[PDB]
Amino acid sequence: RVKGTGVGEKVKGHKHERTLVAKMEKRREAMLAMPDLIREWKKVGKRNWTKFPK
Amino acid sequence: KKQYKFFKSWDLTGQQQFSLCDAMRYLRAVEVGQPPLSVKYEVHVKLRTKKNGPVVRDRVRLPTPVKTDTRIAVICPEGSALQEEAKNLGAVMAGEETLFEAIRSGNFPFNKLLCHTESEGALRKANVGKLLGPKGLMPSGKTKTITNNLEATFRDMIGMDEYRERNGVVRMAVGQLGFTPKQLAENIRVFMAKIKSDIGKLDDTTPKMVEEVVLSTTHGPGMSLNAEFAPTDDKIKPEDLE
Amino acid sequence: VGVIRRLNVVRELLNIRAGPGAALLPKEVTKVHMQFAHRIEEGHMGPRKFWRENLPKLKYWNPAVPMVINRTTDQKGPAVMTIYFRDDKDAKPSSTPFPTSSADGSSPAPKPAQGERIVTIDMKNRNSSVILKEFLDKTGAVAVQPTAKDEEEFREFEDLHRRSEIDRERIRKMNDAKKREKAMLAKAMSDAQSI
Amino acid sequence: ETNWEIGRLIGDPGSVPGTEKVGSRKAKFRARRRRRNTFLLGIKERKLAK
Amino acid sequence: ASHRMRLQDQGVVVRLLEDIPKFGRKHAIFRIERGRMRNEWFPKNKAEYMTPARFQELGLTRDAIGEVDRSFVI
Amino acid sequence: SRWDIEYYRDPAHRGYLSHQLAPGESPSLYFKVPTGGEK
Amino acid sequence: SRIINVRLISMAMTGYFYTFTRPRTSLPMSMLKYDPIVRRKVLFLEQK
RNA sequence: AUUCUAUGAUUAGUGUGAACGAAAAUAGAGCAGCCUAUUAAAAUAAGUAAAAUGGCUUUAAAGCUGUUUGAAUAUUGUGGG
RNA sequence: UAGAUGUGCAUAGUUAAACCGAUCAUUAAAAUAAUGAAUAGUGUCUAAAGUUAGACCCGAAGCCUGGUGA
């Protein structure tokens, strides 16, 4: 009946395991927008760009 | 001697805010009998902003117009869907007979007149071209007063509302007295969003966050607004009237 | 301008829901119309106070009935009000056409529909009181009673005006005393300083 | 999902999606003419209407 | 505000026995400064310390601890 | 421990706890076998 | 103080970055670089 | 249970370094359990446990401690580790 | 009579490390694509040695603690 591995208990998982799916979904979400983001960058220009990360 | 770089921000824990419908119930009573065309609401939104920062000087084109400087009257078939659609757009008058008899009296409550593609014939039969000529209100395609689409033109002849931040507040009208809660509601959401959109568009150094939203009339008291919309009293329900 | 400043100035002006002229009108009524002059002359002061004192208290408890006013410049105009009491046993007629308020008499008293019977009430050189009671007894309506919290609202703001008027005169006595003292000295030094 | 497969969703390797001109220069010329034709023909009808 | 503050003593629980004015009536339980109880009341037999044993004999519990009434006057 | 249980709970190692698994269940105590299809 | 070291962050949200120097009185850097996590060339933008 | 010797151990670990340095367990020497203690003691433990702060010890735990504060009632899961 | 018992080293390598394993590690997926690493130990004696102890021997000025003396 110990924490996690006992009868009825459920393992919690490490932080990098609980956030694994949300981690890969964020990278997938970004690549899908990569083409449209490069077009805006190659169109607006390297100098007039202002949408920088934070 | 002392100085601060901020605008005084009071504590709202004890404030008494009102819902939009509950508030209009208090205001509509103080404006009993007042000309609805000369009585308009107003909103003062206090912002937690620094004195040194910049100011807002953008414009907003509300769904329904509030300024009564350009009163537009349309001529559509009586009872048609355009009649009610015209009122939902900001039309002061929409009809053939009601307008024909109104202009024949000698007093025109409006300053501009339009004619839809469906009421072209009946116009000349009313025998009124001799009336609108001198006043220059003769609806003609030369003035682009005849159109099949209405909302497409109502956005140019009327204009766009202007708002400016003077000192930690922004003051501008939001609707006339005759505005129904449904029309007045969206008329406010368009104003708050355009602001919050311009704030985020601004720099991130000092994001100006809203603190309170007030609502009053030209002769009414300044009351606080709650995000809610429906009345707290279960007996009352959304009711529209003069 | 604190939140409590604006709060006390509001809750005092919220006497609309009070005893003087508030009452729950019956569903039999349909709409109201009134017409009077701008100024107070030739018996026209009565309706004005009825419009600024008791009439607003009806729309709060009766926000569904339209109460319109039609002002005019003709001081001799008939200060009379019509009450569309009859709704044809609540038959719900289609009374779509109805005017709106104005200031030049542009919205006179329209003719009632078939299922409507108006009730005329004259008022000229008569006090609002006699005009008010004539409205309730004729238009049978139950008068709403205030709650204990409303009695505290009247009692609180009443005691407040005591402290206010006590201060209105006090601060007035310090400014004039200064405006007076600042003058006595001006007549002494600033008078000879001109040379 | 492997990170390399997540990168090959936009397209096959060898090119950078978003860098290749989507429209053909010849097509832009054909469109530039049609717009001009309608403008010239537009004045024709408006002149004939007058 | 802070997550840690200076630790202070609220007082000692006592039960009056002489109906002291300005503090409370007879048999009144409340917390009072330790100085007054240790130097003024206890020597004159005006009150008594409310120990966990004293609660049991009197049948009371910790819920009976009241407050000082500065308005009390015999 | 989690690791020790998962080791003897999978049939790849012929663990003496593998009989506790279902034919479609995973040995991990946290991870699960995702489902394939259009949904 | 005339020169600063900036960090160009991958817009693929992989967490990879490049570091380059550029004068303070210059516009932020933005380049198309190779990301070894996704193994493709993506857009890299300056951190701040 | 305690005590003594050896191994564990130039180990875990600490430390910028130089160095410092356990325990479990094992083997041997001895072996003894009790409160009615083979000498005469408990009505089962509250300013205590514990916390903040200043120190000692130390691996950050545990243990010792000045100052200021300050709990609970037993596996029917109360308290310490 | 029988059973058990008593340090350790080696017997498999590889990596920062585990999983893994005659294969392992890096290659953000993997794959003879590339590079590195695989086969007798253990005990004793004799002798020479590294380390820690006075550490091949002799030799300070001085520092600290406790006592002695007008």
Place this chain on the structure above:
RNA sequence: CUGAAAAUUUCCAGUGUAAAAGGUAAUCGAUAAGAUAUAAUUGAAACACCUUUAUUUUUCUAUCGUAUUAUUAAACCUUAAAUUAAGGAACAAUUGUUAGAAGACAGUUUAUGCGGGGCACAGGCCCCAUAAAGAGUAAAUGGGUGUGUCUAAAA
């Protein structure tokens, strides 16, 4: 800037001590008259009234901080076998914590190189010669205004 009530905001002109903006064409006057305001004038900006904010100044409340007073009315302290005495007094004093602070006192450092040492000066890196036709090669040897940089490429 804890909050309430009330009030105050003067460059010239301007009917006059214009706080600012947004909105208004009406508001006030118990029934008879007129005062405000809008207009017109002045000015960059024009006023009642309803609102929402800004500056400054009084009282009140709240919070801090000082200042004084009382205390056998048994804190504590002093004289005093030590008291219903006298005086001081919520200070002082002591404990803990915190900050400043005397070489008064303690420990240690203050180097090394150098045609003796002291003073001074020097300490990494780059190019040329010295260098004797591979490379290397010293001296408080000689050359040098050498050097701890610059550089995202475009309008």
Place this chain on the structure above:
RNA sequence: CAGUCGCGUAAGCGGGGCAUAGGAUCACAAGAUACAAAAAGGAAAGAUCUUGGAUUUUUGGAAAAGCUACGCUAGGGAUAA
């Protein structure tokens, strides 16, 4: 060699600059890796990879002022009169 981008008809070139003048560890900070996780589930603190801030200029990297003619010890004549 693998990965994937640029220029070029093509062959091919490209892992900064015609060449020769910018210091580590530790600690700290920002990203990634999924390694281990002191009963167990987590975490903390660690490990690996990338990266950043140094007259650490006595620049293989101490936080550091003098007098002694009142001077002392060990040595050198390996450097003086």
